[PDB]
Design a protein around this nucleic acid. Structure first.
Lengths: 184, 258, 187
RNA sequence: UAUCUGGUUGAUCCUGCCAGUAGUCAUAUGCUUGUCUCAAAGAUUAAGCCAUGCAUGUCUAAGUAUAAGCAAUUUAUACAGUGAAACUGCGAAUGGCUCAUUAAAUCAGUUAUCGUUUAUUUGAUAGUUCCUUUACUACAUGGUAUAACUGUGGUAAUUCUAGAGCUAAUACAUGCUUAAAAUCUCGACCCUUUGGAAGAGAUGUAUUUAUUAGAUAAAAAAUCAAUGUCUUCGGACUCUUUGAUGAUUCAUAAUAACUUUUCGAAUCGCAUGGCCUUGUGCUGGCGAUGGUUCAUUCAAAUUUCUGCCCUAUCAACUUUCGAUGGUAGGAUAGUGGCCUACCAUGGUUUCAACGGGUAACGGGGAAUAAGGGUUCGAUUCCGGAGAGGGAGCCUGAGAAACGGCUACCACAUCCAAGGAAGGCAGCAGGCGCGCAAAUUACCCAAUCCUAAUUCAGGGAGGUAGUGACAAUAAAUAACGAUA
RNA sequence: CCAGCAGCCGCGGUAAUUCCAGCUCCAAUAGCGUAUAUUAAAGUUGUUGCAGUUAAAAAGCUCGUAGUUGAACUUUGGGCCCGGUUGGCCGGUCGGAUUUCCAACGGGGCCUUUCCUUCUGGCUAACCUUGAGCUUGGCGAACCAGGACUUUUACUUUGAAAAAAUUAGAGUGUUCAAAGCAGGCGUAUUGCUCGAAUAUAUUAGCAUGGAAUAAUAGAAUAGGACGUUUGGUUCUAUUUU
RNA sequence: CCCGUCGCUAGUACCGAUUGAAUGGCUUAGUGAGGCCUCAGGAUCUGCUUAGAGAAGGGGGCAACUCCAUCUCAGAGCGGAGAAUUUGGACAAACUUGGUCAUUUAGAGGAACUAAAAGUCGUAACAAGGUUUCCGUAGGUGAACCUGCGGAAGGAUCAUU
RNA sequence: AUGAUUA
RNA sequence: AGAUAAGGGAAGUCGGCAAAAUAGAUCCGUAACUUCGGGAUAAGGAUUGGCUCUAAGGGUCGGGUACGAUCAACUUAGAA
């Protein structure tokens, strides 16, 4: 009776499991971009495959086919709006060409490291999950964000933690109370 | 199933009411009335999901039972009455008059109008016959049954009515070159100025119909609704007036106001 | 109960359908009436949608039309003498449609006398004018005149008494009259 | 993201299979298990059996109330506030559960009802019902219970029931109340004869039968059976009326009768208002209920065309005792072998009929992939079927109903052994079956439905509990200085 | 050569890289293995798209029904114009848009022996109709109601139609995501407002433009088409008298 | 390297006397409940029409006599509703008996197949395998197999103008 | 004529 | 020499010896096996009277260069 909730996965395992080239390359990517899970990498590859299917099954069709025009323009606009694609490569073949590294570099964690609030992507991960960051005027604690470059303009620290003020800290106050009792 | 149905689940209620697939596993079944089940907008979904004048079906039932509301000049205090096509509704509070017409996107619109523009409506004749005692009569698209009309009035014509009685103010004949409105199918909401038609004696008379950008199409003569002559509509029409521009112009449109 | 559907019959190819459903109420039937003469009994029956159905039995009198004259009088019924469907209905004297029966002939005779003033078998100004104007039409044919001599007239039942509670019909004339007298006389 | 790999040989190329690999709204199980969000869940074997407890009752201003029920009218002497029970009226045929039956059957798209029923809604719609119709009869309105209740009670037990005394109706059974004209019949009478007629009966709706009309591509002449309008009786003759359909014996109208006679308000709540011939006189509003017919709407039932898995170690099937058609009739709500009487011998088939199997309800859809496709689909939505197997039937607009009766069969319960009461494939819960599957909880707050009705009821539904069935996100650690 | 491992090959008979423990290391990660069914793999079902000399697979050979397949041919050609799409000098706007244009592309029409249905009507249409260059009168579909012959399909185009949910997909910060169909903007005291698209949908049924491809009947012991004709037979039928 | 009989162990299926056995479906025949429909039935209640008397009451000839109501009881019809029971019919559950169709299953024994680290008897095949192999058909023999008739090369010959 | 198992 | 026997049913006896049961006709239905001819009346079941009717089945004489009259058998089927 309850109308069933749609659900659909967002990743796909490797066809062939143990190939050292694939494994060492994606381990390189995970250990450089600060990941825990081949799942995240597969997820990004799955998104890339989806967007390429749109590109493929659109470029099969002739120009000025209004379906091709509409769907490709919407794909270009949202992809440029998120910034993984450039602002001058709108010919749909770069969309065919795009890379998993581009998707990961558009994520929040490495973005935090580019803005320089981390000194390491792992520091960015703990800063995100401990919420000492907010991309707008609202806190977020998820790495996979895919910022839209307007986000870059609107970055700041967490209002409810130091480096953007308004409170000194939990363990800071703990140590201060400890030393206040100790000096007495 | 062993007798008439009384219930209606969601996802068997039609699409164009735009009822949400969450919020309880049941939908409002239109009780019988002067319009069908599907080409009808019940007053519960009207007040609760077009205007937001109420929040809960109890509140909508409260309004309908305390008689702030009235359709076709009558209170009609049933929660699931079919407010169908072309119909008039009058609210003393706020002194509004909603008209029920279609939009080109395939939805029941909300047409704000005045009290005198409410006091007349339009109705397509659905059929003509001879009643008892030799009284010719006709019957419209809104269950209205009218006696002693003009002999000029034949099938597919349209009549404009007083709403204090069921009598006629005037009529409009069917012929080539008249302004219309579509009600039923993929063409729901178009407005398209008859260019010709075709007979096929034995069933399914078809009509060629085009809107003012020259753009033509064809529809069944029982799905169309003639609203008058070219240029002037006999009523006020909602935003867009039945044009069905492309998907890309409307994307660019929204991107222009943002 | 007696069903009226085709899920119990065979298909047209020759296949016993399987038993799929139970019998319904919108496929039923009911027993025949076997309607008779004398001491009028009319049971009524509730049907699909209310809509009563007066199941005739034992019906003594009925209505009968004379179509060349357009008139219609109440009359007794002697008995049935021919039925195309079944001689059993003839023998056992059961009234149904299409049934060739004999009637009293007295209201038609006396109406003829009152209307035309012309004798069968064997004064005022207004009635004389009426009969003088209505003349040249009392010349119907030999078989109906002979039957009025006998006082027992052949009628065809055209009602459905088990469906209506009325054995109604019309007098035979001319062509079908000759046809039915031929069918009767075959020996 | 259109991918391959290991294994027959001393070694080589091949065919060819095995095994590996990846996935599954594909189940079971193991080992482990910290979090947010969303959420399947006794289908597979047994449509096997069920304790206990719930799951459908319902009123306004407005059908019936002396509750010997409760507040107080003080606007009310009959009550007129509220109000259980009971009669009445609706609904209980929707919902919910399961998938056993069923392979042109259900079902999906697509047609028809010019072949039918249809409560409820929605729009219109009963001047004609006193039948020697003048005393035949209340129409500011007529008759009868009967429940609830009072008390007498009877069985071990039952939603068991009797005897006696009241009384109610929108319950039953009856029943009149408003014009004017218009045609037919008779038909006194004058009698006229060109012929005029007083006076009298009918006509609403519904059923049943028969008849007539229900139409109409184009223009002039000769007449009559009798002039027909008005007459110069030279003849001017026009004037005239019938709708829809692709198409009807359609809608509809009128003659002639049938009917044991249908319907044509003896119902109810508020506010009480005006004319004066100054009265319980006459009129008058906003509503509710019900009612004959038609249209509409929610339906329902039949129905056109196309499409279903494996089998020929199933090649002929159907027709005794309906199979194919025709005629007639019965029955039907209606067409129709649906059923009967008689008659003709047909109808289907290798273009796979018919018979068997099915771990077969069908479909929308689900898994898996470049394309083509293969497999699954009990399972949230649509349509079917069923209530332990079968059969039958009442009430109703609508049931072949099982949370309705009647019987038979196998189960099973209470017995003070005479008898009584049942079908969880509804919600929980229990036994068994197994590889395989949740709490004998809270609420009508939402979503809808029902009733007399805003108010009540609803294990429909929502909530929480069990829950690693599947999905989404994601802790377990980071950042300095010293060797 | 025991216990045992191992899907497959194989390991183990006193020097085990495979067994059972310790350490190290790798895979996936709040998951990971196993059993059973199914899909890809599988061009190991082959319509796309297998093999038949010898690997399994040409019937002993011929006739032959259903089925499947079936030679070639019948209108081509040219001209004349018209207007739509694509760009294109001049940019005559400071990457939008214009004229005559060199070019292409399909569309509409006329003629070349090319009727590619016409009778009643009203529009008489484009009106030979012309009043001085804004005038009175050309051949009915270009508007329609009816009659009429309308030889058939398969195919294909377009449309109507395929209940939602589902699938693909527009827009949307569920804080991301699965989701869901919401939201957004003010002078934030009166309030205002865009959404909730679109596509797919097998066969079958309906209309529809086409006429290649495949059949399909027409006129040959002429019961053959146009016939203003001319008769005869026949019935139907409005206007009048 | 390899074939078959015979012998031992284990499994799988087949034939098989037993008019085998159980389970389920379809079903002729016979009996046939129960409702429903039709022929009657008539307890029971109830309305009307008179119907005379045991005798009060009053009104009038006030003297016999008359008028109607009354507690009472037959008697007669005129009707309304009306259950138990009942005839006949169609629907048709269930039982008995047979038949038939499928699904499992017992069985003396008979004859196969497969798996088994080292069983017995030979040596049929692979070299010209020591009689070239194989194909069909027929007979024979412990077993492979042998032999006759035709056929093939997959032969041990592509070859005698 | 035949040369047992395993490597 | 002929008959009948409750309940049981071959327990009698060398052994169903004797006796019973079945029996005509019409319709339905029919196995293994087979020399394909049979088995076969296989097995097994149903119906049958009287009376009043209904249906079909015929012979001969008749037509200007479809049908009528008349005469007589039992055969079969069906219904009250």
């Amino acid at each position: 009776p309850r109308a069933p909730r749609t659900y659909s996965k967002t990743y796909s395992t490797p066809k062939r499991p143990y190939e050292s080239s694939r494994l060492d390359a994606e381990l390189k990517l995970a250990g450089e971009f600060g990941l825990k899970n081949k799942k995240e990498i597969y997820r990004i590859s799955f998104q890339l495959s989806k967007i390429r299917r749109a590109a493929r099954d659109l470029l099969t069709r002739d120009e000025k086919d209004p379906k091709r025009l509409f769907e490709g323009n919407a794909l270009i606009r949202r992809l440029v709006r998120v910034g993984v694609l450039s602002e001058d490569k709108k010919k749909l073949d770069y969309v065919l060409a795009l890379k998993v590294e581009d998707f990961l570099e558009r994520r929040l964690q490495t973005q935090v490291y580019k803005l320089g609030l981390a000194k390491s992507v792992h520091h960015a991960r703990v800063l995100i999950t401990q919420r000492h960051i907010a991309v707008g005027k609202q806190i977020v604690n998820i790495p996979s964000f895919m910022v839209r470059l307007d986000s870059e303009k609107h970055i700041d620290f967490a209002p409810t933690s130091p480096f953007g003020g308004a409170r000194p800290g939990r363990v800071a106050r703990r140590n201060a109370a400890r030393k206040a009792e100790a000096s007495g | 199933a062993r007798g008439p149905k009384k219930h209606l689940k969601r996802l068997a209620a039609p699409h164009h009411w735009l009822l949400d697939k969450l919020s309880g596993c049941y939908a409002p079944r239109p009780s019988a009335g002067p319009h069908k089940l599907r080409e009808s907008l019940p007053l519960i979904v009207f007040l609760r999901n077009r205007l937001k004048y109420a929040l809960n079906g109890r509140e909508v039932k409260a309004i309908l039972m305390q008689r702030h509301v009235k359709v076709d000049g009558k209170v009609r205090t049933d929660t699931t009455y079919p407010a169908g096509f072309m119909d008039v509704i009058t609210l003393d509070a706020t002194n509004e008059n909603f008209r029920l017409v279609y939009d080109v996107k395939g939805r029941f619109a909300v047409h704000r109008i005045t009290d005198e523009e409410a006091s007349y409506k339009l109705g397509k004749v659905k059929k003509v016959q001879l009643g008892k005692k030799g009284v010719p009569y006709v019957v419209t698209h809104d269950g209205r049954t009218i006696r002693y009309p003009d002999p000029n009035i034949k099938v597919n014509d349209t009549v404009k009515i007083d709403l204090a009685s069921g009598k006629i103010t005037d009529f409009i004949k069917f012929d080539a070159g008249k302004l219309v409105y579509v009600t039923g199918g993929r063409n729901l909401g178009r407005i398209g100025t008859i260019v010709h038609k075709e007979r096929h004696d034995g069933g399914f008379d078809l009509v060629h119909i085009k809107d003012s950008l020259d753009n033509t199409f064809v529809t069944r003569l029982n799905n169309v609704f003639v609203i008058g002559e070219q240029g002037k509509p006999y009523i006020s029409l909602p935003k867009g007036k039945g044009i069905k521009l492309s998907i890309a112009e409307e994307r660019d449109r929204r991107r222009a106001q943002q | 109960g007696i069903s009226r559907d085709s899920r119990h019959k065979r298909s047209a190819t020759g296949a016993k359908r399987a038993q799929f459903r139970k019998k319904r109420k919108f496929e039923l039937g009911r027993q025949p009436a076997n309607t008779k003469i004398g001491a009028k009994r009319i049971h009524s029956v509730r049907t699909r949608g209310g809509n009563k159905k007066y199941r005739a039995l034992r019906i003594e009198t009925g209505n009968f039309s004379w179509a060349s004259e357009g008139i219609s009088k109440k009359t007794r019924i002697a008995g049935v003498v021919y039925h195309p469907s079944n001689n059993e209905l003839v023998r056992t004297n059961t009234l149904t449609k299409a049934a060739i029966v004999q009637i009293d002939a007295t209201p038609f005779r006396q109406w003829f006398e009152a209307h035309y003033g012309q004798t069968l078998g064997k004064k005022s100004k207004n009635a004389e004018r009426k009969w003088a104007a209505r003349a040249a039409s009392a010349k119907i044919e030999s078989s109906v005149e002979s039957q009025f001599s006998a006082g027992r007239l052949y009628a065809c039942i055209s009602s459905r008494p088990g469906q209506s509670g009325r054995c109604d019909g019309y007098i035979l004339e001319g062509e079908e009259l000759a046809f039915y007298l031929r069918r009767l006389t075959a020996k």
